[PDB]
């Protein structure tokens, strides 16, 4: 096809294996915030990987905003090391990538009406709710947001291979509806 | 100090007069009892209000 | 002799009382919750018709 999606956000969950004090972490950390009335976790941000992590008292942490798998793992390790520097026995256990988000452009307008007519079993086009067509691919469990401008956003992937395969599957279909 | 004890006895007479000189105004329309009840209500607020002070001092 | 007018007036009296009763109930629920109930939703149009 000549086009490869580029990742825009990666979500990864890792367990530190130890209970934590959210108030202490908020008081002692650099960029952390803790609003128990609003959310039950602690939100921290690191600029060099340009990511944000949520840390819970159960010891499980979720890292988002990373553009690459390596960046996600490094950012999660950095957050764990920051928590460890705060005196806690933080570890790096069962790190896993829960979700990946990729974006790309097909460089031509798309007739979403014909697309939903042809693939009604997988398509959902409701301009009242959202201008972008939602396509639920089955062989890879990927949800694609297709827009009339040609931009395609893929989400729900665990590995980059799923993103690339889903785009490879969807590209001939979209080429069939080029405006 | 003996004079201060006498002044405290005078303040006790003044509180009795104030409480009774109008336990009568309420009747014309228990004042001490009402005051005590009011004092009881603040206790809960005071502490909910107060321990915030302890955490804010730790925070700042 | 009770003609069409008085008979329908009796029926409409009853049904408008019922309509106001339903508005009272429906608005009282929302008032207890502290939401500012919409009058148009309170009116049950089917009652009179």
């Amino acid at each position: 096809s000549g086009i490869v999606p580029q990742l825009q956000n990666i979500v990864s969950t890792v367990n530190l294996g130890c209970k934590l004090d959210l108030k202490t972490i908020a008081l002692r950390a650099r960029n952390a915030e803790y609003n128990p009335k609003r959310f039950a976790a602690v939100i921290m941000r690191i600029r060099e990987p340009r990511t944000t992590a949520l840390i819970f008292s159960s010891g499980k942490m979720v890292c988002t905003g990373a553009k690459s798998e390596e960046q996600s793992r490094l950012a999660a390790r950095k957050y764990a090391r920051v928590v460890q520097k705060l005196g806690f026995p933080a570890k790096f256990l069962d790190f896993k990538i829960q979700n990946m988000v990729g974006s790309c452009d097909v460089k031509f307008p798309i007739r979403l009406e014909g697309l939903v007519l042809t693939h009604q079993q997988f398509s959902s086009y409701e301009p009242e709710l959202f201008p972008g067509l939602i396509y639920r691919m089955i062989k890879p469990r990927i949800v694609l947001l297709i827009f009339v401008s040609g931009k395609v956003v893929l989400t729900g992937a665990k590995v980059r291979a799923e993103i690339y395969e889903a785009f490879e599957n969807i590209y001939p279909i979209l080429k069939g509806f080029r405006k | 100090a003996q004079l201060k004890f006498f002044e405290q006895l005078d303040q006790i007479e003044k509180q009795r007069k104030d409480e009774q000189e109008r336990e009568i105004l309420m009747r014309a329309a228990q004042l001490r009892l009402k005051q005590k009840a009011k004092e009881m209500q603040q206790q809960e607020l005071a502490q909910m209000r107060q321990r915030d002070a302890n955490l804010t001092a730790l925070a700042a | 002799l009770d003609l069409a007018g008085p008979l329908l007036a009796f029926l409409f009296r009853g049904m408008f009382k019922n309509l106001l009763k339903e508005v009272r109930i429906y608005a009282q629920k929302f008032i207890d919750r502290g939401k500012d109930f919409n009058l148009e939703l309170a009116i049950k149009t089917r009652i009179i018709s």
Partner: protein
Amino acid sequence: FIQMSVQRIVEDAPPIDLQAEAQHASGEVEEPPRYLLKFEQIYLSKPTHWERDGAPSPMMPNEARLRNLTYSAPLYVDITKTVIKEGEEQLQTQHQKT
């Protein structure tokens, strides 16, 4: 009936008075708001039939006979709603032709 009795029945009905049941368990010095509704000025439209599309259209009597429709006319009432929250301000919003 239509010209006088319907309007008189609307006006004779007592205004609806509603207030909360000591909501929030606060000082509650008449704190629950008072909602007052008064119906007024009943209006009747010409007989109208609304299609499956929802588009209003006049309903001729013969069409009612043929299609088994009911020959009826919409009934509209002006309603005035006043909110008294003991905030020293009362707001009287008016709903026209409900």
